[PDB]
Amino acid sequence: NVSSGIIHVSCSPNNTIVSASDPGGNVLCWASSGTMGFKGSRKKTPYSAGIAADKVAKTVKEMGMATVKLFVKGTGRGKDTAIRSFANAGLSITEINEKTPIPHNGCKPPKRPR
RNA sequence: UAUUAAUCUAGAGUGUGGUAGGGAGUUUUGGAAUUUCAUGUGGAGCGGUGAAAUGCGUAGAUAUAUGAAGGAACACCAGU
Ligand SMILES: [Mg+2]
Ligand SMILES: [Mg+2]
């Protein structure tokens, strides 16, 4: 019932999440590779991210919005598959802002696996 | 060569004039980010891996927005 909104596309290296939300807080729908039905390691493939983006795009288009600001987050692999899925869905993409957390040399990261 | 009695400025210092620095200690201040807590939206997974399983989750997790608390370290500048 709202024309403009935000789409948070978080791409973890292990999984992906797409949350369609009102311009200020109050997420309106959400989807992820797990809710798609993919399980285990298949959740981290770009195709699963595209599937999740397509489902959420169809859902929110039937809900009836037009303009989307796409907030890209994380450092996965299928970071652009969701972008192309939304573009193919056809919602008016206005902004491509990226908001993956960057630190200013605070907090100690985990150990390096070997 | 050593000792003694002296002179000299070229070694080494001192003064005046230019001057570059993440040199050191003490006392205040700041912003990103993680975590926890509080309050809204939401509804089945999240997390993790070579693949999974312990684990967290309908007592409403992951996500999203706002606020508070505290701790540690100070992106970019940053380098033939
Ligand atoms: Mg590790
Ligand atoms: Mg916050």
Author numbering: 8 to 121
Q: What are the paper's exact sentences on this?
A:
Chloramphenicol (Cm) is a well-studied ribosomal peptidyl transferase center (PTC) binder and growing evidence suggests that its inhibitory action depends on the sequence of the nascent peptide. We find that Cm leads to the accumulation of a number of translation elongation states, indicating ongoing futile accommodation cycles, and to extensive ribosome collisions.
We found one base to be differently modified (16S rRNA m4C1377 versus m4Cm1402 in E. coli and T. thermophilus) and one to be unique to M. pneumoniae (23S rRNA m1G783 versus unmodified G750 in E. coli). In addition, the C-terminal domains (CTDs) of ribosomal proteins S6 (residues 131–184) and L31 (residues 47–100) were better resolved in the new maps and could be correctly modeled. The proteins L31 and S19 form the intersubunit bridge B1c in bacterial ribosomes. Interestingly, the 20 most C-terminal residues of L31 (an extension in M. pneumoniae compared to other bacteria) reach even further to contact protein S10, thereby strengthening the intersubunit bridge. Polyamines were shown to bind to ribosomes in in vitro studies, and are important for stabilization of the ribosomal RNA (rRNA) structure and for translation regulation.
